[PDB]
Ligand binder design. Structure first.
Ligand code: NAG
Lengths: 207, 188, 210, 190
């Protein structure tokens, strides 16, 4: 077992849609998940959670720092030092909300002409690109009604080919009934990203 | 450098419904680093973003102000996101009938209800009239200019090629200070 | 450290574009990686080659046997069994794999750039979509005219399972960004997709300004 | 609808090759039987998918091949399907084309050549369609549908729909030139 310390940013889903958000400092690789102490950078009281195995045996413990949305969004730099008897010198991890952010360019693409001729299902494609950091949300609406997650597929945020600064992209395909598309009702891809002015943006499409 | 590919979006936005709410109150909150004010009106949750000088002016929040709202979108939690459009809690009111000259020459008019009006409301209401009676954001009509001419010769201009910039929606004007409005529609 | 045996299929890129495709049998979770014996079935191809000990994702040792020249029996439908013996095993472990038989070919679609980008006269995005296929493994290449583009200039997403209404199928998108002036001038661009269910292994969709 | 008219125009206007005296062992590629051969500084991948999979079970040992490119794969190999004919002079085959000149039915007598006795359906289909493309506007604008009908001495007949590329499994079918009686084409007006 080889103790490792990693600190995790607040989930974008919580920042933009939750009423709470937390940073999570995890210490993985523990043969005996006892006597782990976390202490950080002077706010609210951080809750440790229970021990837990990781992969290939071994254990791990985490410390969530509740109610961190506002400090995170203000530009605060967090530091988490974890002390344990299975490491020599307590390990440290720093993290702060990112500068050098870029808004996603959001596009929603019509179905391929071939699929329109098939007349069964048609594929709508949403593309968000040019954004950083890679964390992003994608939701779908038909008309003004949000579609359940189970009716579309969102790929992982991946780095773009670029000579220069790093940007990310994400695709999402929603397949709908050809009749719905041809009868003329709208479809919308909604994208959440911390660099957007209103946190969310939307593109809408129809024939 | 100028195109017609976003015509449907502009037409949808400036033909959509607006709301003029009175006595709105709410405290300021941090949302994604932004200053927002959430309030419920007509059984609908709203999320007002304060992004221009309206950010500095409403540090505490809204304490009974008038708000001109336009749906930017309804977020996954059901909140209507709207930008700017806050004018002061006013104990005085009067009518200003504003002459609106539209050049494509046609005399129109535009009735304002309050003594302090938001540039957002002026922009949105003028454009909606242009969309519904003058063909704006239809076919090849997109570009042009709104010129708000103030008493004394000062002017304030808005380009029709893009939505009003979020940072300008919190700017306000004294209705009495409006002399007239001219619009020029430059079509292809 | 806990020993585990895994039998991995031949890489699609080797089956469709290489001379030498192979199966890999890996014994992970070893405390001492020497002393492993691998017995392959069928036993009628090139000799198996056991690799040097390797570290796995937890400080344990890993050793793998590769069966080269496996493309012929793999495509014939033979099932491969790999048996591994090691002092750290009470009894030998067995893993079995064969080429899938319930397969579906991809529906390949090349989508034009978003209207907005056609106004920027900078770069425009072309999107290749391959969907409805099984198994997951798929290859995606791009061409401009009749010239293959290097993969530094497009990014293909991972193959993922589609929202299903019974049968499992997968989908991939690939993003190629090209100069706007190349696109407006009339050049054609091709997405080339490789998949074992495709009649000729490869298929191609081509696109230009209609 | 007409969504693939350009794919059909590219295919049936592309360059075809008539090779003779081709030999090659059958290899397994992606589970199918292929024969690879080099002609005119080009590597070819010939797929045997019809009944020719059984006909040429060993491979080729001097047969004639009519090559049409489905695609050039990333290794530079031209992939082609069927078109194999026997290992053992020109004939001019005549062709009636029924087109619609606005409001007039215009029947044209046309023809094309072949250099073999036993000829593959792939060759006949491709050559017919190429002249329909070149001289009659097929797979341009709105012209995509219609039928090629090949009548044979005695009455036997074979049809080919123009709305679809010829089926891969029908590219190993073969005929004798001398047994062809009529070949009539109707260009359906959409
Ligand atoms: C901390 O945030 C993560 C983010 O997804 C969430 O899953 C978890 O339940 C939260 N836990 C606490 C104690 O706040």
């Amino acid at each position: 077992c080889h103790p490792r310390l990693s600190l995790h940013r607040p989930a974008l889903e919580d920042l933009l849609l939750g009423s709470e958000a937390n940073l999570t400092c995890t210490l993985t690789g523990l043969r005996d998940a006892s006597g782990a102490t976390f202490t950080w950078t002077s706010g609210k009281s951080a809750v440790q959670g229970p021990p837990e195995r990781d992969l290939c045996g071994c254990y791990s413990v985490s410390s969530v720092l509740p109610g961190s949305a506002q400090p995170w969004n203000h530009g605060e730099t967090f530091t988490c030092t974890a002390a344990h008897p299975e490491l020599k010198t307590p390990l440290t991890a720093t993290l702060s909300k990112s500068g050098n952010t870029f808004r996603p360019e959001v596009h929603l693409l019509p179905p391929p002409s071939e699929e329109l001729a098939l007349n069964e299902l048609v594929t709508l494609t949403c593309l968000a690109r040019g954004f950083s950091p890679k964390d992003v949300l994608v939701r779908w609406l038909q008309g003004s009604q949000e579609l359940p997650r189970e009716k579309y597929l969102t790929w992982a945020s991946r780095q773009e080919p670029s000579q220069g600064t790093t940007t990310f992209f994400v695709y999402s395909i929603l397949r709908v009934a050809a009749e719905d598309w041809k009868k003329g009702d709208t479809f919308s891809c909604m994208v959440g990203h911390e660099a957007l002015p209103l946190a969310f943006t939307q593109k809408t499409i129809d024939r | 450098v100028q195109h017609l590919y976003d015509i449907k979006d502009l037409h949808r936005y400036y033909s959509s419904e607006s709301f003029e709410f009175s006595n709105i109150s709410g405290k300021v909150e941090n949302y994604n680093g932004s200053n927002v004010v959430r309030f419920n009106q007509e059984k609908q949750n709203h999320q007002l973003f304060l992004l221009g000088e309206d950010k500095a002016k409403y540090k505490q929040g809204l304490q009974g102000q008038d708000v001109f709202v336009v749906k930017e979108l309804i977020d996954p939690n059901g909140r209507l996101s709207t930008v700017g459009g806050v004018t002061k809690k006013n104990n005085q009111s009067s009518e200003t009938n504003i002459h609106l000259l539209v050049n494509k020459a046609t005399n129109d008019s535009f009735l304002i209800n309050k003594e302090e009006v938001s540039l957002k409301e002026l922009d949105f209401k003028i454009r909606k009239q242009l969309v519904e009676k003058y063909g704006l954001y239809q076919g090849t009509s997109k570009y042009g200019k709104i010129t708000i001419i103030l008493n004394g010769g000062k002017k304030q201009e808005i380009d029709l090629g893009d939505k009003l910039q979020f940072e300008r929606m919190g700017d306000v004007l004294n209705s009495k200070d409006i002399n007239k409005i001219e619009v020029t529609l430059k079509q292809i």
